[PDB]
């Protein structure tokens, strides 16, 4: 489903207030894309569907640290 | 003057049967309602 | 644990046939007793087929309630309540007015 | 099994049709256990009545349905074997 595999960001819900203040149920989707991340210590790519906030977290913490606790949680890659 | 119930035991058992009800979520809760009401048949 | 067994002399306390003595034949499960010689019933019986035979009006005895009979004493010749006072390891049923065992 | 010889045969079905068939042919109609194959009620007749069986035919019987107060009640569906024997050799 549309959850980031790094952050767990799924879709959330809210409203669509008009100028006459009609509220309508919409939904807020994460900016999740597919990205291949190079791991040196495995000599391959892993391809995980992450948000852009997850991309920034990979940039800050390293792919090895995030890929360590993806599998403690028990994700695919 | 053909009427609206034309009986077939196979179409009976495949639309309304036990395994058809227990294949889906809503039919499993048909059986749990119809078992909670205490009915003798529960698969008709 | 019951007050009245079969091989047991009783009198009838407050029935039709009260004051009459008898021995207990049958102790029914709905706490009613068949007692010999009292509550005599005239049952009209059809005679039987299959070469069976029972005659017509047979005269048997009806069950009466266990509250309607009391244990007869044969020492004071009175109705006496029974109890379970005397024992060493074996419960005997004992008379209550005189504390002497029912036997 | 060492058992199941004593469990399959449930008694001779007595009827006018069974009687005339036991007299005329050599065929004896037994009521048998409702899950009994043709060969385990052939070995049982050969074991218990000490005969040579040449054929067994079978037929399930539906139990009849009786109406009363509190609805329809059904009798038990039962099973029925015809035991063809050699033309002498009548079983007892």
């Amino acid at each position: 489903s549309r959850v980031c595999q790094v952050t767990g960001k799924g879709p959330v819900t809210g409203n669509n207030i008009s100028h006459a203040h009609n509220k309508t149920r919409r939904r807020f989707l994460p900016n999740l894309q597919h990205h291949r991340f190079w791991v040196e210590s495995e000599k391959r790519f892993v391809r995980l569907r992450v948000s852009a906030k997850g991309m920034r977290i990979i940039d800050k913490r390293g792919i090895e640290a995030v890929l360590a606790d993806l599998r403690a949680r028990g994700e695919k890659f | 003057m053909k009427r609206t119930f034309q009986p077939s035991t196979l179409k009976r058992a495949r639309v309304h049967g036990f395994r058809a009800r227990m294949a889906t979520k809503n039919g499993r809760q048909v059986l749990s309602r119809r078992r909670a009401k205490g009915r003798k048949r529960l698969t008709v | 644990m019951q007050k009245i067994r079969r091989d047991d002399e009783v009198i009838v306390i407050a029935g039709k046939d009260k004051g009459k003595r008898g021995k207990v034949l049958k102790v029914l499960a709905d706490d009613r007793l068949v007692v010999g010689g009292v509550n005599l019933i005239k049952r009209h019986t059809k005679p039987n087929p299959m070469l069976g035979q029972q005659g017509g009006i047979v005269e048997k005895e009806a069950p009466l309630h266990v509250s309607n009979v009391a244990i007869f004493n044969t020492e004071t010749s009175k109705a006496d309540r029974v109890g379970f006072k005397v024992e060493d390891g074996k419960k005997i049923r004992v008379f209550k007015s005189t504390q002497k065992p029912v036997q | 099994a060492a058992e199941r010889v004593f469990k399959v045969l449930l008694g001779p079905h007595i009827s006018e049709k069974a009687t005339g068939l036991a007299d005329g042919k050599s065929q004896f109609v037994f009521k048998v256990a409702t899950d009994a194959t043709k060969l385990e009620i052939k070995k049982a007749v050969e074991s218990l009545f000490s005969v040579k069986v040449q054929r067994v035919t079978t037929l399930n019987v539906k139990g009849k349905t009786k109406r009363t107060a509190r609805g329809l009640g059904k009798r038990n569906d039962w099973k029925k074997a015809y035991i063809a024997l050699q033309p002498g050799q009548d079983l007892d």
């Binding site: - | - | - | 060492a2 058992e3 004593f6 469990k7 045969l9 449930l10 008694g11 001779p12 007595i14 218990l48």
Partner: protein
């Protein structure tokens, strides 16, 4: 009774006892099927005798 069945009757002795008194149940049902069974309590009690030998065959 059952402690009579435990008294030195082994695996094979009670095992032989079952197939002995299953002949009894067979012959009682054979007599029930015809008219030639007068006393009907034997039919009920061979069941519970087989039940007792199969009870004492688990426990050893």
């Amino acid at each position: 009774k059952a402690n009579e069945l435990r008294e030195e009757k082994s695996g094979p002795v009670t095992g032989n006892n079952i197939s002995h008194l299953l002949r009894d149940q067979f012959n009682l049902r054979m007599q029930k099927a015809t008219g030639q069974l007068g006393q009907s309590h034997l039919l009920s009690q061979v069941k519970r005798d087989i039940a007792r030998v199969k009870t004492v065959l688990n426990q050893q």
